[model samples]
Target chain A: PTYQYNMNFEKLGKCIIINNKNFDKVTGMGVRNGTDKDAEALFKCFRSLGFDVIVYNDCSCAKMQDLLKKASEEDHTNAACFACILLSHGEENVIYGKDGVTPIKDLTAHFRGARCKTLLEKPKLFFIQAARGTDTDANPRYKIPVEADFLFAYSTVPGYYSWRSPGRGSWFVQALCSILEEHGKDLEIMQILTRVNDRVARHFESQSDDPHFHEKKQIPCVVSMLTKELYFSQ
Target chain B: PTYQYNMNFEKLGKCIIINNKNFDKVTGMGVRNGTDKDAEALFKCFRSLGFDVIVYNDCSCAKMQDLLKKASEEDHTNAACFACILLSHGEENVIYGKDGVTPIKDLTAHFRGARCKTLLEKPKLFFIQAARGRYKIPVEADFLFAYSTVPGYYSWRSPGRGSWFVQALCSILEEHGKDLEIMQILTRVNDRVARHFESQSDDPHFHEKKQIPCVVSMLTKELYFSQ
Candidate 1:
């Protein structure tokens, strides 16, 4: 099974980033303070990686589905892969829109191998930054499809709180950008991500007055089904 | 930075298994049940692969460190690589001894290349089952840590059967140890644990949960058990 390597990244693909920072106060989710920094870093990083990056801020649940569905429908015959970054408050298995919540699957389903033929053999990469309601008790069990060539790089593991700084950005995105900037062209995608996991696990720690959130830890989960090594070569 | 390959696992070094099942009741750690199943499976699996197997059960914190230090002191010039498995209750950065807690690093440091010269330039594989903890292998070369779950996540265990990690590990090692590379074999173990098992218990906290094994590798070359 040969995978078409996106040798030329400069002109090949689009990076759609859904940056959901502020939510409807009436919906009761706390206002995310430092997420704009995350968006800024992602835009700069992907652009440097040769992606035509677009940032969508504070989309409603319906709008999110519509935007992804439209993006899926576009012809990707000339592109190497598609990337999406979702930054918002979320529980396990779901992310939140401005008005309400949406299952992460519902948004990603539009780009599944069966539905989005244009992107069938191409990679679908997702960088999700959200809280996974304390998965402290039960062991997590997640089902990934055998196909789809989808790569999900989650900010935290299945049942852990993802931390962010009110002054700086979320831990996951910061480490991601740093690693990609340093090693994006040289290393395989998994190798770069493995460094990201190591960075998040070791270098960062939560500091807060709230004991529940103090001295906390985080490790990114990379769920990859791509058949071959992926590199965003210049 | 090339690493010498030991293509034959048939003549590999000994497998030291430290099975910590019974804990001091005063230490506040619960006694582990059904962990003998894990020991049995691992013993059989490694023995079938042709390594000498040894098991040490219920050691205190000082004794655990002493045993690893002694093992690291042995001459391994004739052997291929080294393997150790620890089954015990654990917390962040630490695992329980029979009497109390011990930092996992204290035990692993004995096997560091600087300390254990006989095993220099050889693979040191540690399969550990405990609670959520972050493991930073001693900085050197050729060490692989196969943790039960990702850092900060609980490793699931079934009192009746065994832990999801050891089950998947021994199962994959039994089936593919000879045919697949080390990374390939561990990846199958990760996938098997990810897709196959879920937690089942009457306690609401323990019932119907998910688990996935995690492998952290720093090997410098492809490792195949058989040439």
Candidate 2:
């Protein structure tokens, strides 16, 4: 079959959201006070986009992995695409895991085309990580194709901080949900994410009392490998 | 000191180019081909903007550190701003030194406002890296990094032809240096890199590769080099 922009919302797949708010006190990650707002917004937004949406709250690292593995094990032959949203405290390559931390790669490896046969040549997954800073030591010297048909959207550029509001969720998720609200049925996925990037970079700013924290800015990072246009249609 | 868009190119400060081509055998970076064209083009372009220009080739990591420390130590009190172009093989967060790899921050830390007193409250730096990937960002106030591509993506350069980024940069500067602000010039550079070039390599992996230059600006003011 030829690649078509078949974003018929009724044919859309599943959306999984991991909302890690109250971290394990022992893990030393402070309470993610404003994260539930992100989960709520994403839930509402993705549901509107016609995905069967589910939210997992405060999953430990092992639980998170298991959950994702279980989902990835299911045959996705009938689904349009898969989506996951991660809301938590994070450092570069790893996200918080309630009781500990987990490398992001560990979670995403489940859906590799070779491993998830049914999703082969289909748009397999899209993920959003609301987190901060990236590993500075990664030296990617060669060009090797890792996986295909996946997108990893980060809340901010590497080496920079991702901003969150005590009253609001995060600059990233808020911008994403708002943009999808306005453009979900009409625009392509990349266009929607581009607007998310623009809004986060141009419209938001930190208002902390500390001089170093005040007036800081953020830009969302979108890494995509989708081979076809994606539209979440009405 | 107040920020100003002094467009007098005649009084602009020095532009230092660390053109690392041949690498130490041990670093395994090998020799970077097609970079001389970039260096030569940049030399001509920045010189035309009326800055005193200098090129340093094949510097070891320590030597790179020393040269920048010395430059930052110099009195830039009368100059407009500082610019350094690094043309070399780079990995995320690090660029190749002749002997080894150097954390980009180690080189740039010398020019921080607290340390490089003369450039305090003034626009201090701009850079271009061949590598593409995210890294820890430096927290300095007045720096801009115009990367050849977005983090985690590859930038295209032909072995015989120059890099798409430097070519776009020189073209934009030549056409708009006298007319637009620094950000505007860089925006055009981004667009040119994004729209005008694509990889022609026969290898399926890299063939038809697309590039879009990334600009991380922490500049606190408008910069204009028109005279």
Candidate 3:
């Protein structure tokens, strides 16, 4: 089980950032539409990573699959791996498809370890910045660990609320950009991500226009497929 | 940030095995009702670890909680950590309360870093054999990473129905028990739970059964959590 080959870890080209920024008024149950500011923050972060980044606004299932299918067919075997972010609303196993919601697994699994076989051995990082359920945030604090491959970076945990700064987008995106700007090239993906988690966990709070909405925070879930350290840019 | 003191890795208690033979019911929207055989396998494996064994029949939440509470209150705190096996019907956050279901968090969180703070630093091990959601499991040859059709999909465990979580868990437990850390253990938990456990969707005759359990631990690292 030992083999050495000439490989470049530096530049992973042509990444698709699927940013679900809104939802249908109905199936979404009670999701607040994400703003363009959220998209802007993401564009800035990934671009700095040197990705030929393509940011998609709220989209439908058909459009999503088509986009991914086309993306998969294109030979990005040179790319490190693919990353997707869902910043809208969801039920349990699925995410919203702009006018409606699609199964979260279906959306991502389409690009799983098998389907997008090229990305198989590579890292498929998912920065999920959305609400999994409409349930009110629990009174006590709960922290869930990162599971296996397919890192699920969540805005919050299941059945809990996610937070965003009125001035600083979501806590997750803000810290992500902050850390990337500082250490994007120097630090490992996990290290940068952990720092992001620490920042979001400790610093950011959701204080809505209403005072009653104060004291809220967003925690991202990082379900990584990486066996080694990862950096956006070498 | 540097403080060295007396840390006793010894005096940890032996493992304890509990296998509920005839328990098979998926969570609210779960798949695969578990059978006694899966439970039997789990019980025997833990027994091999030299644990104080106790196998209970279908018990209510209150009874299960009482048993765990009593176990927690015991002087076993000095031991490395503790272990609890919950084989029942449940949802995303809750476990079966016998007559009903309660948040699994309600049960485990009771043992948080602050509450059951004694075991806080220790590994509060929980092997939950239940479904994560309500969906037909997606299967692949290399690996099977199943997802409940819906968020709160239920799993089934009956005389006829075998629990997916228990079966997969036992398989993985038996496979990688000796040399794995708690993380490695649970990572195997997620893997087998992902691959082997599945719920059939199309045919009633071949209706698949599936269960995915969640593990929340506060262990530092490289802990067997068993004495």
Candidate 4:
């Protein structure tokens, strides 16, 4: 028999947005000038998709872990899924907070099935908008247990710059909102992400101070550990 | 507009099976007892889906790399896409040949756009039943890497029943290979591996460990295996 994740639960679940715009001078990371716009776009988009959305801004590294740990401990018996969005600066496997950097795995480890019993067997979605490294428009690169039922949607390939236009926000968030608002309720999750990949690939190119970065491309990467054909409308 | 890969080309392309079962004494790697079963099942499964399948067994580290580089060098203009399956002993981002180890990236690098112009913009699929240390995979366009076990974990095989991954993979592809899109079919494979299998070992630490297959997709179009 075929199985689809049961979306009949009472709530669509929570969506946490970690919007880090400033850095403590010691960390040497720059201000994320337009992340507020991306966070705003995500807040509205996920809310309209029926998620109980919460936005946390300028968090410290430790606070990011604390926030998600607390979320994991909460009772989610009636919720269908959990989601998180990080609008920050990062490299490779780590994301930044105002105070410093934290490994991406550490933040997400809280919600793994062994740790977050409430979310066991439910989809936990993460959308990240951070440059993996300093490389411009280049580079590239799941399953279950504590890692199952999760999706890591990265803005660009690894070791590459994830572009943002202070004038227009990130290419990833812009296309993500456009697609989710248009099809979030109707399409299977992976199918929806595939379209997002299409939108980013076909529509945007980087505009940077360095010629090496300018006119370059970005492709969203989708890492799906969800074992079912996920449908939000179900 | 929504996009789907056009599969009406003259060929479905080569499916290379690198099955390394024996290890040299210096490597101290156990013989991959039932990997031949995995290679065989994959060969039959892919051939049914229109792939021109070829199986190579007991490859040395250097031979494995050369085999794939040569495949990537072939003229694939008339073919739709390519598939490679590796059934071997591995740890993290490295695979074991009969003689020693090779980084997975070194083996797959020959097919990247800069290296293999003929496969540019066409899907290059790699299915690995290996261990992981979470080394990065290619960030190139039109590539997909499907791993049998999640990183930092071990993949299991039954001496008599083949691998948990290939067994479930062939079973699902047998049922839905003709009709379902690739991601949907792979998701079904993921579910089968997760819900149906568990390791039973005499060592307490190795027993009852669970596995979840992973699909890291960079494909921009929906893929269907239509013949």
Best by lDDT: 4
Q: Write the per-residue lDDT of candidate 4 for residues A119-170, one digit (tens) a residue.
A: 8889899888887532222122222123568788878432233356544667
Order of all candidates by TM-score, from best down to worst? Answer: 4, 2, 3, 1
Residue-wise lDDT of candidate 4 within B77-153, one digit each (tens)?
98889999988776666778889888777777888766887777678998888753324555656778788875446
- Report the CAPRI category for model 2: incorrect
lDDT of 3: 0.51
Whose DockQ is greatest here?
A: 4
lDDT digits (tens) for residues A24-100 of candidate 1: 88777877766788899999999998888999999999989999999999988778888999988887667889899
lDDT of each: 0.71, 0.68, 0.51, 0.79
**What's the TM-score of every candidate structure?**
0.54, 0.58, 0.57, 0.91
In model 1, state the lDDT of residue A109.
81
List ranges where model 2 is wrong by over 4 Å: A1-10, A29-31, A77-80, A117-149, A156-167, A186-219, A224-234, B1-19, B25-29, B34-87, B106-135, B138-227
**Per-model TM-score of chain A alone?**
0.85, 0.83, 0.74, 0.86
Q: Give a tens-digit lDDT track for model 2, residues B1-227.
A: 13334434336887899999898779766676778888998999988876789999998888888999899999987877888888887766777788988877777778965588777555665566565332455544456666665444566666787788898888878878767666557655655664565445577865644565655454544667865
Clashing pairs in 1: A135-A159, A139-B209, A139-B210, A140-B210, A141-B210
lDDT of 2 at B6: 49
Q: Candidate 1 or 3, higher lDDT?
A: 1
| Model 3 alpha-carbon miss at residue B35, Å | 11
Of the pair 3 and 4, which is ahead by DockQ?
4
Q: Please give the fraction of native interface contacts (Cα pairs under 8 Å between A and B) kept by each candidate.
A: 0.00, 0.02, 0.01, 0.51
